[PDB]
């Protein structure tokens, strides 16, 4: 019995590989050679956020590009005003080892997670004025790696248990679960349409999951080592992954294969964070070399380097309106670039 | 400037003052990471220090200074990821069962992996060889010989500069010193000297256990200061 199952699995894998290779008529590089080059995209630091005490691990932009939430390994969530630099709120967290934070699409709620396995959603519009723990949902058997809001009532969170789960804030229980990953889930990103979401795990693979249907539609295995970060392409048809090999890989959710592999010899440090600009041309990826590099999605060449930090760039993000870029590092300083 | 903007700047200054105030309490308390396999008696060591939670925090004050010991034992077996969060920490407490020769190899391998970690190449590792009484009783009974698992033990001689405690059987002292030397050699392997190991022998009734952690943390902080002040 088990032998037949193994043979069937091997045959299915071989068939999938053959079908994927058959669609490789031409690489994205060959098609992106006639387009003009992006040129040296030089960037300057506009704001310096000296408020955080300890390593800044995660940050996210709200619906308004002027609001900025950031989490540090000291248990503090500081809401930053990117224009005037004024601190809007300071939330003393219960768990000090927070690794992820999220800003709701409505701006009224913010979530976070870490080694405590608990996700405490903080309401910023409380009638009492002071921020209060709205729903401290739990149930995961591992550290939380990433959190993203689908709506004011639903929130999806990834955990080291190798299974993602979509939670109902009102009910406070697991609405649906997503299983199949072999390694701990490292990152998660929502599509622009909120229909599908993609997450990466410790294994060298990434899968696409549907919000309505609790099942994966596609699976990618083009990575060579542990995949750390993942981000959806601005159109929702493709995504890029960061791994511990100094090479970014752009995966398409329609061709089901890697389009371009952004790699360089001198770059050997692992990728910690990845993000996309509103136009998708400028692909920003954070490296452990205490600096961030910009990669042209089409030309695949290095568009620029952000070396303003002096420690591992742990997180980065582009505003929704396309006006600035934020970067976080373990040096407790968050710099905004434009 | 508008009144609303001025009040917002005032609130931002208040939040900055609060953050600066909390910074003192943060930098004043020392954070410690507790690591060890399921077979290790780390639980007993934690319970003794009375001076699905993926994280367990333990605050204990010793010599007018607070120590924050964090232990992770309710997560998946793989740890190469969440171990990175505990960088820039004061010290790492590694507990190993010196009595169980079977799991001893696994403990040595885990200690070697932790020591050679890229992100922990600057964090000192405090090593407590727990269950010394069990190891002593086992080596006295003669039923389980270390040679069956480590052939080098047979050709290992007790260190000349050793200081056997009063009432310690020769075999027990030799075995514990062999384990100590093995751990020190595993730590020195590819060691750049940026961090140092602090091996100590602990028991299940020993009351003077927190003093060892205090001394190790003090020495680590002194070395870090000497490094920052460009004195060494």
């Amino acid at each position, epitope marked *: 019995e088990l032998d037949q199952l193994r043979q069937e699995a091997e045959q299915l894998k071989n068939q999938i590989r053959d079908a994927r290779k058959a669609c490789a008529d031409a690489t994205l590089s060959q098609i992106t050679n006639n387009i003009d080059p992006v040129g040296r995209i030089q960037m300057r630091t506009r704001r310096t956020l000296r408020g955080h005490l300890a390593k800044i691990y995660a940050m996210h932009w709200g619906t308004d590009s002027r609001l900025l939430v950031s989490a540090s390994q000291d248990g503090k969530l500081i809401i930053w005003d990117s224009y005037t630099t004024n601190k809007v709120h300071a939330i003393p967290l219960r768990s000090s080892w927070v690794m992820t934070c999220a800003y709701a699409p409505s701006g009224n709620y913010v979530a976070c997670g870490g080694l405590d396995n608990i996700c405490s959603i903080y309401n910023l519009k409380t009638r*009492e004025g002071n921020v209060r723990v709205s729903r401290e949902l739990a149930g995961h058997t591992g550290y939380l790696s990433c959190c993203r809001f689908l709506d004011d009532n639903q929130i999806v969170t990834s955990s080291g248990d190798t299974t993602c789960a979509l939670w109902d804030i009102e009910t406070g229980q697991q609405t649906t679960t997503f299983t199949g990953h072999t390694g701990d889930v490292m990152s998660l990103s929502l599509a622009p349409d909120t229909r599908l979401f993609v997450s990466g795990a410790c294994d060298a693979s990434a899968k696409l999951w549907d919000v309505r249907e609790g099942m994966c539609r596609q699976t990618f295995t083009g990575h060579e080592s542990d995949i750390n970060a993942i981000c959806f392409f601005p159109n929702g048809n493709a995504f890029a992954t960061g791994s511990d090999d100094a090479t970014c890989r752009l995966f398409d959710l329609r061709a089901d294969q890697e389009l371009m592999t952004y790699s360089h010899d001198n770059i050997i440090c692992g990728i910690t964070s990845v993000s996309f600009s509103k136009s998708g041309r400028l692909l920003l990826a954070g490296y452990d070399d205490f600096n961030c590099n910009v990669w042209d999605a089409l030309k695949a060449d290095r568009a620029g380097v952000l070396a303003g930090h002096d420690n591992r760039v742990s997180c980065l993000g582009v505003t929704d309106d396309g006006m600035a870029v934020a970067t976080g590092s373990w040096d407790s300083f968050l710099k905004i670039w434009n | 400037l508008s009144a609303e*903007d001025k009040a917002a700047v005032e609130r931002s200054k208040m939040i900055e003052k609060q953050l600066q105030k909390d910074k003192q309490v943060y930098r004043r308390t020392l954070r410690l990471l507790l690591l060890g396999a399921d077979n290790s008696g780390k639980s007993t060591i934690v319970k003794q220090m009375r001076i699905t939670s993926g994280i367990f925090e333990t605050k204990f004050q010793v010599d007018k200074v607070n120590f924050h010991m964090f232990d992770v034992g309710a997560q998946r077996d793989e740890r190469r990821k969440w171990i990175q969060c505990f960088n820039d920490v004061t010290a790492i407490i590694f507990v190993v069962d010196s009595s169980d020769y079977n799991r001893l190899q696994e403990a040595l391998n885990d200690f070697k992996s932790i020591w050679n970690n890229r992100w922990l190449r600057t964090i000192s590792v405090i090593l407590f060889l727990n269950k010394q009484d069990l190891l002593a009783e086992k080596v006295l009974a003669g039923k389980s010989k270390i040679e069956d698992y480590f052939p080098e033990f047979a050709r290992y001689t007790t260190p000349e500069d050793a200081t056997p405690e009063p009432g310690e059987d020769p075999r027990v002292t030799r075995a514990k010193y062999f384990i100590r030397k093995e751990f020190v050699d595993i730590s020195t392997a590819s060691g750049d000297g940026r961090h140092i190991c602090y091996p100590h022998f602990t028991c299940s009734v020993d009351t003077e256990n927190a003093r060892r952690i205090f001394n190790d943390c003090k020495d680590i902080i002194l070395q870090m200061n000497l490094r920052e002040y460009n004195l060494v």
Partner: single-chain antibody
Amino acid sequence: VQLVESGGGLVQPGGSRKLSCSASGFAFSSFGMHWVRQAPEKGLEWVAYISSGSGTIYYADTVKGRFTISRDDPKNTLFLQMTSLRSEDTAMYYCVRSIYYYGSSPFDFWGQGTTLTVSADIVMTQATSSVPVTPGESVSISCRSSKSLLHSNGNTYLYWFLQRPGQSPQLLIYRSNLASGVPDRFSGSGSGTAFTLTISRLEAEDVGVYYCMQHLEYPLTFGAGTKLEL
């Protein structure tokens, strides 16, 4: 959220009286307090202001020097000491909370107010003091200011308040933006020097006095008030 003012009563000219107000149901320390007087059969008028932590304190020129405002965070209470009360100072004083940050809505809650019986700044002008209208009809109130409230940052520091007969003022608009709990029927739009408040469909409970206020400068000037009759 709740605000209860006390310390009222009859006082002779030149006397002294210490007003007080207790705050509950919210983080008093995070909200700044305001005092607004309302003379009998007249509009509102700003009295004094106290920021968080007693850092910034301002008083109205008409009361500057005589009144002294103070707060106590440990007890979550507010105090207002008045000395040398003038005959004109006879009016009802309302305490108001305020918190300032991006997306905030200052003056969102007005207390019950206390009555005290005794014995350049921007000016605001409204279209008319009374506008009788039948229920269900669309109502539009206009306003004008002597100085453009549109600051360089693009924010229009215009505020609207509705004081129903026998009730304290209620915040309708703080900047177009609709205050929490207020029906969507209320809307506001206008230039930096001209403003208009529109009600898509008037309700039976919408009767009352509509007061405007500018917040570009701390000397907050209130309007004459526009009454609506069913």
